[PDB]
Write an enzyme that holds these catalytic residues in place. Structure first.
Site, PDB file in Angstrom:
ATOM      1  N   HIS A  13       2.759   8.902  -4.466  1.00  0.00           N
ATOM      2  CA  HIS A  13       1.862   9.974  -4.888  1.00  0.00           C
ATOM      3  C   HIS A  13       1.588  10.958  -3.760  1.00  0.00           C
ATOM      4  O   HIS A  13       1.450  12.161  -4.009  1.00  0.00           O
ATOM      5  CB  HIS A  13       0.539   9.394  -5.389  1.00  0.00           C
ATOM      6  CG  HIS A  13       0.628   8.749  -6.735  1.00  0.00           C
ATOM      7  ND1 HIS A  13       1.465   7.685  -6.998  1.00  0.00           N
ATOM      8  CD2 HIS A  13      -0.017   9.015  -7.895  1.00  0.00           C
ATOM      9  CE1 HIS A  13       1.331   7.325  -8.261  1.00  0.00           C
ATOM     10  NE2 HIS A  13       0.439   8.116  -8.828  1.00  0.00           N
ATOM     11  N   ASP A  48       5.830   2.959  -6.409  1.00  0.00           N
ATOM     12  CA  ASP A  48       4.872   3.859  -5.766  1.00  0.00           C
ATOM     13  C   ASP A  48       4.966   3.769  -4.244  1.00  0.00           C
ATOM     14  O   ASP A  48       3.955   3.691  -3.545  1.00  0.00           O
ATOM     15  CB  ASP A  48       3.444   3.579  -6.243  1.00  0.00           C
ATOM     16  CG  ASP A  48       2.480   4.698  -5.899  1.00  0.00           C
ATOM     17  OD1 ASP A  48       2.920   5.864  -5.816  1.00  0.00           O
ATOM     18  OD2 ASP A  48       1.279   4.410  -5.704  1.00  0.00           O
ATOM     19  N   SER A  96      -5.657   6.657   0.492  1.00  0.00           N
ATOM     20  CA  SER A  96      -4.431   6.464  -0.268  1.00  0.00           C
ATOM     21  C   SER A  96      -3.220   6.609   0.644  1.00  0.00           C
ATOM     22  O   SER A  96      -3.140   7.543   1.447  1.00  0.00           O
ATOM     23  CB  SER A  96      -4.358   7.473  -1.414  1.00  0.00           C
ATOM     24  OG  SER A  96      -3.070   7.483  -2.003  1.00  0.00           O
TER      25      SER A  96
END
EC number: 3.4.21.107
Lengths: 296, 296, 296
Positions: free
Chosen positions: B45, B81, B162
């Site tokens: 992401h 991911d 993140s």
């Protein structure tokens, strides 16, 4: 081995998955083994569908070892969000050690433990944020809403640990996780679970009052919104728009505390209710009735 | 110095800010140095816009010392991911120490560490809430959605950490923070990052199946919603409305577990798929295909 | 006794409930005793209604021992979300021990302590997530919005501990809880509370600029949206669409950092403002004005 890892591992054998299934739906929650005979405590939300639709739902208990066993509803109390299941003739059960929630203090480190084999199961960690905290709880479906004196914690309480135990650092159960989180204290659990095991039902006091919270400079508390006809409050002299400030020996801050304080009264015994009526303090005497007359 | 303060300070030199900028937009994430040659792992992401629009986006890495260095995409895996960047000829890199996520246990205290110089950077603390937890992840923009076996934690996972590492109490990386929080386990990261470094690409198994979750008293699992023509499931005998309950050696509870279990199969090798079809248990044999035939 | 239980119990006597009531409304917050003469610090949101409507609202302070005492507003600073109350001739006050927020480090364990007798009171636990973190705060009602350099923590900050102290493991106040949580650092609190006690007011620098955040590959920072006529920026040469990148000695990442950096300038003294104007770097000299000319 981590400090919390040890405590979580020590209680895992005493925590179970509670699964209710029909031929079109299925839900899961957590519960805790509280007696060697096979008695298991959860919250009333976890079983709500099976209790309300027993012809179509079947309830099973899944243990830490993976064994799956049928379970039967011993009794439930939507007013305290508690329920008791029973497994029959299961040997070598690891019964949880029940603590004393009256010894729990703000800041105590706790674990909110969900069933290890549950699908969305969680184990969360935090501290006790507040004690004797009245919190409203929405009934799951057709169950009536209620308010309980809860243990508040900043450990996350979610679907993955609902119905499981709130555990202190001695690996003792101090509460039952509800559905920023709340748990039913273990001492109140003991009283409710014992009566659900003796009687299959709990009888709570009732006055026939509905209140709304009020907070101002004149009189804050629970303002009487309605008085049922023939109710104990009806005969005790309670009137509408009365702002109840004390129920028995407990001051009432709002409607949430009012509901909880009423349940602490003695059924059939006179008790004082202090109100502020048209700017005038008035003490009233009410004899609470049982909410379940046939079981009383 | 605090117990967590020491661990957070010990890994700070190994955590970097990842900044991708065009002349009209700019985003930031975190990453972790995993090899002295300059390889950096983040989640897919964080880089998604630069990877998908490389003509207009430029990616840089900002170190703990404040140095800013160009970075190049080595490879990415939207299905796990994960992604790997490379900085060239940077000396005295503090490489992070990679743990073993198979030794992580529920209740382990962890830190979710974001890049110390990031704009909205955070460092959060919690425990491991669940292991091998299938969680769906939404692709950031045009990236496809996916499901991963994650480490669940009640440490807050947010924009500020993140792509940064999930750190145990030995200051070791046990996971990569995703975008109540989840992290990609470090052992799965190692496998994916190594292949992204050898091959610049990861090849995952595929069967040509889309499923929807089902949970009832007859058969719970992942109900086959669609079978692609000419797919391995098409030749293996899988039919629509089949309720898949096992893929290889892994039982499948729902669609989330189905996606993850399929990726554990061996490409080109026969494997069993157990289904419930019209109330009848059926075992089927499927030979998974590579999702990227040219890289395989 | 638990590690956090001891710290929470050690500071409880220094934390107070702050209750403002009219004859139709009433709100509660927390505060901390900071001086033996009876000075109490809270955040500007807790008192906002009483400060703005003093003819109809009355403010009281409830101590740990249950004593209720009238309180008077010494001063407030909506720009730093801080306020000081005073109780008169209260004996044996347990004054809180004020720490040094410049010694606080990321990962430090903290408690966000609310007033023990507050209605919805909470005590939460976490770590320091970030330091000197500019965060925008919405003014409660008619109070103007602001931005502060906050201590960020993953301890829950809520209505139940807003205005109470952020406490380190030495039972020292390192911050004031605001209304994923933020606290006003104690060193900035000391400066603001001292001036509110000397002067009854704080004077902050102003330039006459409104900005919007921008982030791209050319020039990121706070883009000048408006320049007030006759303002210090107006005379200093600041123009619209300028992208401010540095204010004084502090680089500015966005509008949030711009607001905070401006408040660090010296009133009446020349100071440099670096901007990017039509792709051209330009340094400007501005003499900030006091936001309250009569109190200066």
């Amino acid at each position: 081995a981590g400090r919390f890892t040890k405590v979580a591992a020590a209680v895992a054998d005493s925590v179970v998955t509670i699964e209710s299934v029909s031929d079109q739906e299925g839900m899961q929650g957590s519960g805790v083994i509280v007696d060697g005979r096979g008695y298991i405590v959860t919250n009333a939300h976890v079983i709500s569908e099976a209790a309300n639709n027993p012809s179509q739902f079947k309830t099973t208990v899944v243990f830490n070892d993976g064994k799956e066993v049928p379970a039967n509803l011993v009794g439930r109390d939507p007013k305290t969000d508690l329920a008791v299941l029973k497994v029959d003739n299961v040997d070598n059960l690891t019964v949880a050690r029940l603590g004393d929630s009256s010894k729990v203090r703000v800041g105590d480190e706790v674990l909110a433990v969900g069933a290890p084999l549950g699908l969305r199961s969680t184990v969360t960690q935090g501290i006790v944020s507040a004690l004797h905290r009245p919190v409203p709880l929405s009934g799951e479906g057709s169950d009536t809403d209620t308010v309980i004196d809860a243990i508040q914690t900043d450990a996350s309480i979610n679907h993955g640990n609902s119905g499981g135990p709130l555990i202190d650092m001695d690996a003792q159960v101090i509460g039952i996780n509800t559905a920023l989180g709340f748990a039913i204290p273990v001492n109140e659990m003991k009283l409710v679970a014992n009566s659900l095991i003796k009687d299959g039902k709990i009888v709570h006091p009732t006055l026939g009052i509905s209140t709304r919270s009020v907070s101002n400079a004149i009189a804050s508390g629970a303002q009487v919104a309605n008085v049922k006809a023939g109710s104990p409050a009806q005969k005790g002299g309670i009137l509408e728009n009365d702002v109840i400030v004390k129920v028995g020996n407990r001051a009432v801050a709002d409607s949430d505390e009012f509901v909880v304080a009423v349940r602490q009264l003695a059924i059939g015994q006179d008790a004082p209710i202090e109100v502020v009526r048209e700017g005038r303090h008035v003490t009233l005497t009410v004899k609470p009735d049982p909410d379940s007359t046939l079981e009383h």
